[PDB]
Design a binder for this molecule. Structure first.
Ligand SMILES: [Mg+2]
Ligand SMILES: [Mg+2]
Ligand SMILES: [Mg+2]
Lengths: 134, 153, 148
């Protein structure tokens, strides 16, 4: 974290001198709207949180955002009609024919997870969240 | 100076001279190729108007830039796409590239630099994107596998 | 071994692999496990290639009427200009034949059914002309001798 970054984080933290529901409010003042489940995960990776732990939580959240964005943008390349959906067949084709090709067993598993409702369509934002859940 | 109806501005011999000067910085052995991973730097290093200043990925990926194995781009393809960016799109343009290739061939005794097209910048971009997804999925699976293993504890 | 080419399949956007059979017929096939679908892509000039079936040793050629055929001997009809359309596809056209007056090239192409098309019915901006090399390996080639 840069000094510039720590400054902004101290600023937001100071405004709520911290409770668990207080964190929710702090996150809101940083423009985020995490679900309660999301908030619990952030807390767990570390009901009162010390500053230096907030910094650690913020650093981690920004890293997570980056990787979420990287994967989302990677999917966007293949959603050529820009509707947020990629057909399971196309996903299967891309995964087995490009890059570090997935095996048949790996790709079967991907489709099992990526197309839960089994309609032959993948909501890739959904699947991005699944892969970044941990 | 050369100018067309579609040109952002005219080009002169100095621009083409400048082009080779910069080329030799990236291709000191005059192999006639640069690796695609320095193309962005090369494009940014030219003088205006041939220059494509960073960020320049979008412009580059929109150009016809064929890549020989592996991930190597010929100076002639680069030269043509960059000058077309400036001079603008035209009918003759496609025919003009064929003629340029012929003139380059007649002047060039070094035949070793001729290699067939294998891929493109855009295709490479898709390979990279697929790998981002593949890596994410393998990380996901491995995290899961260890997770299941640890349950027994 | 003076030329640096590739051993490769040529995948057609129409959903076929180009194929040059033992009997000399050219077409597209769904059989992703065929010896024939193998080609030597040999550079014979700047963005000029010869396309040769590995199993048959025949060269693809286009005659003065736009018809593609196979040639045992390497001739000027065996040279293809290689170009990319939209930065996503590779197109191969006659070096010497062309739409008279129109100035439009004549291209190697397959139709929706995987059938070989007349060179002058194939347009660079149409799916039929759209190929993608699927390279196996880099290979050195002795230069073919030009005949007539
Ligand atoms: Mg879509
Ligand atoms: Mg549904
Ligand atoms: Mg679905």
């Amino acid at each position: 974290l840069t000094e510039e970054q720590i400054a902004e984080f101290k600023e937001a933290f100071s405004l709520f001198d911290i409770t668990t529901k207080e964190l929710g409010t702090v996150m809101r003042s940083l423009g985020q709207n995490p679900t309660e489940a999301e908030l619990q995960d952030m807390i767990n990776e570390v009901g009162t949180i010390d500053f230096p732990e907030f910094l650690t939580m913020m650093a981690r959240k920004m890293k997570d955002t980056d990787s979420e964005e990287e994967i989302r943008e990677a999917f966007r390349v293949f959603d050529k009609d820009g509707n947020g959906y990629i057909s399971a067949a196309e996903l299967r084709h891309v995964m087995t024919n490009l890059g570090e090709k997935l095996t048949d067993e790996e790709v079967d598993e991907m489709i099992r997870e990526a197309d839960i409702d089994g309609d032959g369509q993948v909501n890739y934002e959904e699947f991005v969240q699944m892969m970044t859940a941990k | 100076s050369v100018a067309t109806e579609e040109s952002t501005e005219p080009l002169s011999e100095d621009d083409f001279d400048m082009f080779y000067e910069i080329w030799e910085k990236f291709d000191p052995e005059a192999t006639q190729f640069i690796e695609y991973s320095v193309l962005s730097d090369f494009a940014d290093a030219l003088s205006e108007p041939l220059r494509i200043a960073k960020p320049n990925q979008i412009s580059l990926i929109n150009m016809d830039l064929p890549m020989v194995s592996g991930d190597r781009i010929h100076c002639m393809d680069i030269l043509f796409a960059f000058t077309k960016r400036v001079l603008g799109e035209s009918g003759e343009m496609d025919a003009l590239k064929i003629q340029m290739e012929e003139k380059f061939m007649a002047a060039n005794p070094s035949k070793i630099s001729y290699e067939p097209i294998t891929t493109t910048l855009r295709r490479k971009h898709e390979e990279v994107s697929a790998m981002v997804i593949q890596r994410a999925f393998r990380r996901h699976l491995l995290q899961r596998s260890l997770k299941h293993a640890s349950f027994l504890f | 071994p003076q030329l640096k080419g590739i051993v490769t399949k040529l995948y057609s956007r129409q959903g076929y692999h180009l194929q040059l059979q033992a009997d000399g017929t050219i077409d597209g096939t769904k059989d992703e496990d065929s010896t024939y679908t193998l080609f030597n892509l040999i550079p014979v000039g700047l963005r000029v290639v010869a396309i040769q079936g590995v199993q048959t040793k025949l060269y693809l050629a286009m005659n003065s009427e736009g018809y593609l055929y196979t040639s045992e001997l390497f001739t000027p009809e065996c040279k293809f200009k290689e170009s990319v359309f939209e930065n996503y596809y590779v197109t191969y056209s006659s070096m010497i034949y062309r739409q008279q007056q129109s100035g439009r090239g004549w291209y190697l192409g397959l139709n929706k059914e995987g059938e070989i098309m007349k060179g002058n019915h194939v347009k660079k901006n149409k799916p039929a002309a759209h190929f993608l090399p699927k390279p196996l390996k880099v290979a050195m080639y002795k230069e073919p001798s030009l005949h007539d």
